[PDB]
Amino acid sequence: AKTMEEASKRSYQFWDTQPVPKLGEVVNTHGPVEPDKDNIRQEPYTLPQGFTWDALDLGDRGVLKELYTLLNENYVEDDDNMFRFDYSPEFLLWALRPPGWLPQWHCGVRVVSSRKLVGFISAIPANIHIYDTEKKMVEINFLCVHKKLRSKRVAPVLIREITRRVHLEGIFQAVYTAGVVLPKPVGTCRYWHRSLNPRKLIEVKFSHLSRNMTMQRTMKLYRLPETPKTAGLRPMETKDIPVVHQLLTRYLKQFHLTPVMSQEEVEHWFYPQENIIDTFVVENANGEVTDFLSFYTLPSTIMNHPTHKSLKAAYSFYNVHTQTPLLDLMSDALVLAKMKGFDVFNALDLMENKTFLEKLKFGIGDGNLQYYLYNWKCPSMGAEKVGLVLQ
Amino acid sequence: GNCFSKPR
Numbered sequence: 245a246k247t248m249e250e251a252s253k254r255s256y257q258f259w260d261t262q263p264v265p266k267l268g269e270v271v272n273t274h275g276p277v278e279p280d281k282d283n284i285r286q287e288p289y290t291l292p293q294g295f296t297w298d299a300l301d302l303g304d305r306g307v308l309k310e311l312y313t314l315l316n317e318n319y320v321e322d323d324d325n326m327f328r329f330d331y332s333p334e335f336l337l338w339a340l341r342p343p344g345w346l347p348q349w350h351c352g353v354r355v356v357s358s359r360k361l362v363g364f365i366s367a368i369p370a371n372i373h374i375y376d377t378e379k380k381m382v383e384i385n386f387l388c389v390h391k392k393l394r395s396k397r398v399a400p401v402l403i404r405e406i407t408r409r410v411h412l413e414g415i416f417q418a419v420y421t422a423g424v425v426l427p428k429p430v431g432t433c434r435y436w437h438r439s440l441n442p443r444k445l446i447e448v449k450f451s452h453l454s455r456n457m458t459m460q461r462t463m464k465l466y467r468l469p470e471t472p473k474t475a476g477l478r479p480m481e482t483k484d485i486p487v488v489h490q491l492l493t494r495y496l497k498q499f500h501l502t503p504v505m506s507q508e509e510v511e512h513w514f515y516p517q518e519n520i521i522d523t524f525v526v527e528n529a530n531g532e533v534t535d536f537l538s539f540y541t542l543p544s545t546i547m548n549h550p551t552h553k554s555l556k557a558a559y560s561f562y563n564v565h566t567q568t569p570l571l572d573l574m575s576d577a578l579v580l581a582k583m584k585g586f587d588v589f590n591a592l593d594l595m596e597n598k599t600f601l602e603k604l605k606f607g608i609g610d611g612n613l614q615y616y617l618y619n620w621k622c623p624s625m626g627a628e629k630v631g632l633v634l635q
Numbered sequence: 636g637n638c639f640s641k642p643r
């Protein structure tokens with residue numbers, strides 16, 4: 245189910261067993277669905293015959309390559325099966341080893357004979373602030389199962405084991421994003437797309453030539469300046485971590501679903517990593533960092549095309565503004581993404597993004613992204629109040 | 636960006 249009222253006809257054999265609100269009920273309360281567990285099951289769940297759980301050590305170049313191969317061939321694809329995500333192995337380390345990570349939270353499923361890797365689910369620790377409560381949670385990401393093994397009960401087995409792994413560490417809530425519709429989204433966010441290299445997107449059928457438009461006008465409509473216009477804009481470095489932390493912490497207090505990051509976590513998620521995360525800050529004439537922007541790089545493999553293979557994309561992260569308008573900040577981000585060789589710039593409609601989306605030639609996309617909270621009952625909010633970005 | 640979307 246991709247649209248919400250098509251989920252109404254469905255019935256959930258597994259999500260009616262889990263402590264999540266029902267899709268129909270209105271939520272007027274703020275609290276857990278079930279009590280914290282006194283005893284936690286000690287034995288891993290039973291995988292089907294010929295399969296055994298593992299714990300991938302991503303510090304191994306060989307195991308990480310296995311994880312990249314598993315995701316590169318079996319991860320998320322578009323609705324028409326044209327594009328598949330292409331997370332970098334260096335990207336995976338960035339998003340699977342933040343401060344506090346645990347090896348048993350990189351759960352993998354292997355075949356006993358081949359020792360091949362046919363599944364994966366992940367969990368990293370995250371301090372999440374939801375409405376007026378601040379809860380120690382985990383972010384579930386990279387739920388993958390091999391294509392040959394699909395549609396045979398293996399997905400609900402992955403969810404129960406990873407829950408058991410995190411229940412053993414005292415954490416009983418969780419947060420995660422998905423495109424499908426499940427009980428029950430606390431927020432729904434629409435993707436928007438800004439084309440930096442419109443020639444390639446049209447050739448690979450990412451977008452189509454609009455109503456009554458030539459390529460020459462479209463090439464000249466989406467063109468961008470050479471260099472950024474904002475004064476004193478430069479990449480982030482070590483000396484900028486404490487202030488960038490301080491800027492994001494106050495900026496987020498207006499939204500209702502945000503993270504709570506320590507100075508070590510801010511350094512991890514925002515310090516520039518080439519081909520993974522790009523952060524730029526704005527330093528004024530008094531030597532004060534007053535604004536910053538950020539985007540991360542996630543390309544996807546172009547399928548069944550003889551000449552075009554990859555689709556380089558940049559995803560808007562967190563952009564905090566205090567003395568520079570958000571409109572100028574995001575415009576220079578497009579220019580910065582154009583200089584680095586991106587073909588498209590994707591951004592959600594969460595936070596204040598709906599103010600600059602239309603004005604900066606962003607095109608509204610087909611897909612929806614849902615936000616979920618495990619074991620937390622709270623009233624659903626609007627997309628303008630979401631302040632949480634995951635990879 | 637966790638799920639895939641194209642311009643419409």
Ligand SMILES: CCCCCCCCCCCCCC(=O)SCCNC(=O)CCNC(=O)[C@H](O)C(C)(C)COP(=O)(O)OP(=O)(O)OC[C@H]1O[C@@H](n2cnc3c(N)ncnc32)[C@H](O)[C@@H]1OP(=O)(O)O
Nearest residue numbers: 256257258259319320385386387388389395397398399418
């Ligand atoms: C305290 C700690 C709590 C931790 C737990 C928090 C929960 C975290 C939840 C994890 C979400 C993390 C989000 C991400 O990481 S993003 C996940 C999206 N990933 C992909 O699409 C990658 C490619 N697809 C796949 O690998 C397969 O399609 C998967 C493995 C996803 C299922 O393909 P398969 O054909 O093998 O399925 P099945 O027949 O075994 O079983 C089908 C059952 O699974 C339900 N299903 C399908 N997709 C999702 C989904 N994306 N989130 C939750 N449930 C999903 C489905 O509606 C049905 O439920 P129901 O019909 O029984 O109701």
